Design a protein around this ligand. Sequence first.
Ligand SMILES: Nc1ncnc2c1ncn2[C@@H]1O[C@H](COP(=O)(O)OP(=O)(O)O)[C@@H](O)[C@H]1O
Lengths: 234, 256, 48, 231, 240, 240, 220, 146, 129, 239
Amino acid sequence: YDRGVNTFSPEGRLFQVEYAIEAIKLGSTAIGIQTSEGVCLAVEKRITSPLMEPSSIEKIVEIDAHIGCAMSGLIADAKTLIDKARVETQNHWFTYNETMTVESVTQAVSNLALQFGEEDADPGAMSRPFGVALLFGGVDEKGPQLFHMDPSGTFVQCDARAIGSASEGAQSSLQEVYHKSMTLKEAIKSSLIILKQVMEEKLNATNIELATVQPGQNFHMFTKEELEEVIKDI
Amino acid sequence: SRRYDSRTTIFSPEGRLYQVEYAMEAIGHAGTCLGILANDGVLLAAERRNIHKLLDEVFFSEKIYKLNEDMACSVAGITSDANVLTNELRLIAQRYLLQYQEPIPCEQLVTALCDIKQAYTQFGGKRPFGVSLLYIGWDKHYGFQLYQSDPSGNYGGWKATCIGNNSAAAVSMLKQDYKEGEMTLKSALALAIKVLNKTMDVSKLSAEKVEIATLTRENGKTVIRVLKQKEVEQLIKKHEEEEAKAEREKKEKEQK
Amino acid sequence: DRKIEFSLPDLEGRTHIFKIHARSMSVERDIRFELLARLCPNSTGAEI
Amino acid sequence: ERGYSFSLTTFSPSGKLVQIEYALAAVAGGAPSVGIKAANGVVLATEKKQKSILYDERSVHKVEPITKHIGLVYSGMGPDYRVLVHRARKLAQQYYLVYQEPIPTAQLVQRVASVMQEYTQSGGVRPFGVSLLICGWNEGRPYLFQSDPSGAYFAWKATAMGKNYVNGKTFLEKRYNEDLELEDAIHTAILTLKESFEGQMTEDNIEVGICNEAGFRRLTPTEVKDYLAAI
Amino acid sequence: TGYDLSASTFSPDGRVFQVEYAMKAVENSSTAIGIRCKDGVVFGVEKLVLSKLYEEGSNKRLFNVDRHVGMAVAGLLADARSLADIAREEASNFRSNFGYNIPLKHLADRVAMYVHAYTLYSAVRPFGCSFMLGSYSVNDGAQLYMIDPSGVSYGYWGCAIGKARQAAKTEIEKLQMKEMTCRDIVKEVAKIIYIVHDEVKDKAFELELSWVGELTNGRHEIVPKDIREEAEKYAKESLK
Amino acid sequence: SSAGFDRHITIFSPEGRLYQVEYAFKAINQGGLTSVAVRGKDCAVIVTQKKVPDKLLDSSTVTHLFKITENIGCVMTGMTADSRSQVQRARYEAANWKYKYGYEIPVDMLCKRIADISQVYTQNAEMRPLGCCMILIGIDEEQGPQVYKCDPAGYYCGFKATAAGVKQTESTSFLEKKVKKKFDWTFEQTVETAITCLSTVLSIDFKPSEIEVGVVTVENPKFRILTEAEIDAHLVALAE
Amino acid sequence: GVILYGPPGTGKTLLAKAVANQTSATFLRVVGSELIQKYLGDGPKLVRELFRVAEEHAPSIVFIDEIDAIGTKRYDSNSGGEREIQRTMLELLNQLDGFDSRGDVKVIMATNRIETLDPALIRPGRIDRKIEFPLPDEKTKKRIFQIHTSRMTLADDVTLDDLIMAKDDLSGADIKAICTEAGLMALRERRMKVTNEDFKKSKENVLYKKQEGTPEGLYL
Amino acid sequence: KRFDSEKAGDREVQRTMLELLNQLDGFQPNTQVKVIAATNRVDILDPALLRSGRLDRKIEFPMPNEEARARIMQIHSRKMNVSPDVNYEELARCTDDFNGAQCKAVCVEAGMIALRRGATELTHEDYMEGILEVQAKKKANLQYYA
Amino acid sequence: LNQMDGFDTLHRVKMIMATNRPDTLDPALLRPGRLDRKIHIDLPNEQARLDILKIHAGPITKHGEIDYEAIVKLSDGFNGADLRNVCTEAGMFAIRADHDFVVQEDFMKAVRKVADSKKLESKLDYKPV
Amino acid sequence: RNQYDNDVTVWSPQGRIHQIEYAMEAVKQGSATVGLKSKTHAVLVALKRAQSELAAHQKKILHVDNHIGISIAGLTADARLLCNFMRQECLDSRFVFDRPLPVSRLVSLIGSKTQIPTQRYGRRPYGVGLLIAGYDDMGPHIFQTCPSANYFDCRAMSIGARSQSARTYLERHMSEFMECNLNELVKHGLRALRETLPAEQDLTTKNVSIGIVGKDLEFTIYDDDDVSPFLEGLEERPQ
Ligand SMILES: Nc1ncnc2c1ncn2[C@@H]1O[C@H](COP(=O)(O)OP(=O)(O)O)[C@@H](O)[C@H]1O
């Protein structure tokens, strides 16, 4: 009835990491699109009440000045991963006088993604896997790269991935409208077109937040009142 | 290994803690104690659970434990498990006196022991401390204080308390028969005797099953006194006559 | 010799169960069922 | 090693510790014992019944001293008795090292009671299964205490423990009273051990340790031999 | 039911079922035979392949604890390697802190206590290995010991560990090992291995042998490959 | 009459008994051997039969007559691995006492240390209670010969003549009638009684190659293991 | 199928007795405490015979009061009668809708709890009308007090509005417990019809009967 | 296994078992009757069944290892039309922790898959799809490996 | 119980009864007067297993080299009936390749086969009376 | 009600640990890799797989040292942990002894590493399987590791899901492996690997990777850019 945190299934996969995979679609959706001139991100805030201030809920958290992130799942669990990724980027800059590649910081944040233990030592080591999937986007040295991380620690490169509750619907709607030769405004318009029918509420300039990382502009722009330029076109 | 674990940390399917309540039920019988204050002087009244005839009684101590120059504590529940708590709070008081070179206020000592009691229910996997005790003391800031405690670490200040056996009737009679700021230390003793006559099922109780300890204040001394059996007998007798006095109101009136 | 399994349909079979269960009704020929199957993601035939 | 560190003595839904009552039932099926404190010293008596005549009676002992004036007897399990005897001896030696005074019996009783309590509460270990009886003549007045496996302690003028102890308690309440001397306390302790003993009662069967103001003395077989005759 | 879960749980019959299940896992392996003689100790292990899964010398079951100590294992593998490094560490520690070579009795006793230290608690599981320990010295003669996963070590003039053990100890009992030298007892060991092996069910058998003795002047080494190892031809000549 | 985990971990039953030591006693008589110790006026003797069911097994390493210290001897019953672990622990504690306190450790203090070690095994609930027995013999100045028997439950006691193993009840029933008439218990009388106890309990009339006798005495305190020649002499002197 | 759930004492079965007077066909009441048997086999046989009698008679209605006592969960599967209850409910699950569903038989089930129920019962096809029973705070409590005090006297000094004014945590079983006991003081003292203090001490004692010893000094 | 218990269900069975044991061996021995018994567990049987003339030999039946598995499929596919380019050693290597009945169910399932596409003679991939059906693997989503 | 002693006593009537579990019998059945003497039959000793084997190997056309001492050594805890199975199984190995005469190697082989089977039924040891 | 198969400490009445078999079931769910060798070269060819239509393919081959190159099938975090252990051991060997590490003592080190979690309490077996190619002083080697910590000194073998066709091909084309050059050996490796795939699609130069070590050749990994010289000259699939 009750088994340990490290237990293999009779069919052989696992018995706790697949439950963390099952907790992914209880969160909000997040779409990241990589294009040859920049990496665009978008997310759903999923407001509940008008009394809640909408600017408090953040999903797009920057790690380095050239690297973004996007969440799906339990935000409090992913805060530790984002803080650790910030620590690794600053340590690698301090010890090597150059910026991290986004693959290296994804590897550094995925090394400790599967480290739960009961027999293990330390001052309270993780007892359960983190229940988040993270999207990273950046322009390190080969240009625009987008990466996806899942609770099993597997990281892969994706051209245009969507995670969350309606991940399969947004993926199947992302299959047809995509090509390698497109631009950033077309990418933002297509991602907003996909996010139109996914959400159960009505879209405005306060229910979503988007962020674009380019080789030219250092951080990511498009806060409020800049979203209204592309919302009224949709 | 792991199947042998008794699981003394997890909540219950209704969402309320499931192991602390059994300790509170253990406190709910096996003992009777109370405390009273509304003016100068604060009294503690306790009941002897064991009144066997072969006890020496020369131990000169009871559930009433002295712990400082200006405090006293009375325990309830498991007698074995209260020595640890009394020694711990005595150590806390002496550590405060070593540090700040002043006697410890009541609030800080009660909160420190309640944090120590809460640490077992928070984590550690051990059984909780099955002891609920009651403090009386004097302070510079607020004067005479009475404090209750629970095995869960909850606490609170009080003026008339309940820690022992079946005493919801005692709580009701403490609500009904209490005065505000007029309790000199001769009516509070009679109130305690009147209450402890009714909580215990032994009618016409003697000076063997009752213990009264008073904390008063001299000219800078804070005298903590345990009352001897020579005066407790006539203190009981002064209430024993009151029942016969009160039954005379229904005797001289029914004459027509 | 066979372990035949069942599961929460698809999206199309919900429309099929709608078309075979609600055909015995007095409804005007304007109801769209694929939207109604879209609005209920996970359901059985008994729920339909 | 393993390191369990979980407490397996938990509260019942009725509001009690079941393992403490089970240990007390283990005590109640133990060897009988009696202890009488009467106005000049304390007398402790027990029963050593061997299963065969091939045993050596003088090899093991049950009235085990602790200091020059403190004695101890027990009722319960034998293996769980030498451990707390050794712990009490080491603790009394620590007290004598610190304060340079023979240890009063009351403090010894509280500290062995605290040891029993922390064995009940701590992780991975079972509670003890032995009720103690600690005697000693400190500062003039004799003292006789009893500590149960719950980790508490009481004080008795005259008590009994082990198998058939409620009738021994009624015997001690009826036959004895507040004031005796040492020798007739030995006589009534021998009688109340004889109320549940076998057909014979020699020095090879019963073992009596007395205390007085001249120090703790475990009786020789000769003294118990002439005491057991015509008594 | 529930007594067979942990090692620190006694059965109603007084048994410890975990070491019995360890012995059950032990007897599913292939046969390993060791014969003591008047001048040395010969090992023999019937290695099994499936299609190849190996080269010549792969999945080796003849280990080497020290220069004079030989070790032949039979049981669940990768615990044999752990016990081999354990016995190597004991031999190296004895050489470093006592000067001379480790005697076989002391080493077998030490590894037997290390095996027995795992069938006491509930955290660890008992081993699934039952090896051999053979050596030859001038001042101590030739010795052979066998250790079971329960932790019992006995001396043997000849023993077999594995699946076909009860059908192999009788063939050891046929010969008189107190008088023969190494050069004929190697072909006797090969004949015993060829007799005890069934070819209907496996058909993928291959010998490996070993040597401690005065022929290998107090050192452990494998029989010289293509030179010798024609005892397989002799055992094929003794097919009936 | 259990309480869920009454069978498995070392805890108290509702009847007051703790069951793991009672299930561990069956490990003593599971082994199938019987050992008798007899103490006389100036000697203490140990007799134990040994089983050698296979001719290839070495007959010089079967013996349970273990040597603790040069004047302190012991014998075992039960599981062999726990017996050897207790042997090594007793040797270590005797050497530690001889290093610490300057003089030779008495037999009763060694038995107390062994019992105190075994008590922690039944105190905690994470170790197997180590089901093997203990019989120690020695000589102590102004006390004569001493014989002690420890227990897996941690109960040690002195004895005059006692046996452990499988046939304890019948051997003690015969031995009580033997000791009840306190006659001249000399050396030959003690070895004759110790041999005839097993001879009358088992009724086998054993050959001298299957009986091990250990001796300690006041004429020389050194522990001696009797070889087959003196066992031959005592057995032909026993037969009238 | 109709299932009625709520807090323990609200309207549960009561309402079920009130619907069994305006009905036209016969009404069969069974209790879940009766639906255990010490003999292994009479469990599912009694359930089968219960529905066979109800089906052949009329368009009858079967009311299984306290059905949550048996069909709560199946995850234990430990030997004894605690798994026999799982076996005696599987026949009820199969006879409710498992093959050729019976005409003109209407079932109604009363529970105390929701979450400890088997989800194969919870699915449609067996019960559909999930009915919730909340506790009315003051408005119908006037009408409950109007009904309960209707067939008795009432004096001018006793009025019931202030007794429930500050309290919003009672139930309809307790109000009848108040009104039956408030008439019991007047009969036991041989006093007048109703006094105001009759209602005052009835509220305090019924509170003692409802909330006596719950260990909540720590508010979770 | 006869033990100390209650009720009448076990006691009637133990009555018939004690009748069986005496009539099989003991008083009035008979040669002319030969008894054959079979089971799937042996820990439950009474030790009085392992006495003198009750059960003489104790016969094991392990799971088929490699060549037994290739022998089983050759026997069952005798009636079926088999295309003569299939090697059973590859099937026996891939099929693991099976038995006689499961390897029998591979052959029947493989012959149907040729019937689904209508082909008369079999193929290798007919057998492999029969293998994948027999293992009865549930829906996986195991795409985060390797 | 009633017709055992009862009112009418018996004359020249003796009743013999046998079982495998004496602990489960009724105390009124096991009281003396109805069962005066309880006779214990145990597992055979070394010489007891030896002459049992001498009886059962009587009508066996063995070749005159057989030593029973080694055979009785690897049989501990055997019943009085497994030795009869040992004598039966040795002829089965004689039936293999129709060797007619029984050789002592077949006795050592058949003993190890029987002791292999005697590991899945044990722990009987019922309490006397 | 199942029992005996929830931890590595508990044995079975049949005498096996079912968690190790579950780890084998885990390691046979990855994609198929093939490793083989000649008298002077060691080549492992691995088949990458796609988790989605537009997502990139997860790489399999990754270099450990100048001469050891490992493949992977199974998990990924434990793969990175074990690969970090190989890297640290190779660095310590080149730092202390200033020589290349032989592959046999390296896999003995990893066997002693992986046997520790399958004996204690609450430690899972490592759910990875490695194919290790290396050119030490005496010949090239291709080794295979298992989650049971039974390393096998194989000569040409495949791992992963549907590797029995590759094993049968390597058996029937075994003997002519040492006399051929690198170019024919690589084509033999891809012919062994393509039997894993169903007979509809082929090796489309974006789901394959080839790693070579040799006598004078550095351990090189080719993926999607230098693969195309090896795909040309290949015969079509016989179907
Ligand atoms: N609204 C109401 N009107 C009248 N009586 C009520 C009302 N609500 C509850 N009661 C009384 O409360 C009692 C409990 O009803 P019900 O909840 O069905 O029983 P139970 O609590 O045993 O399940 C009934 O006897 C009924 O008389």
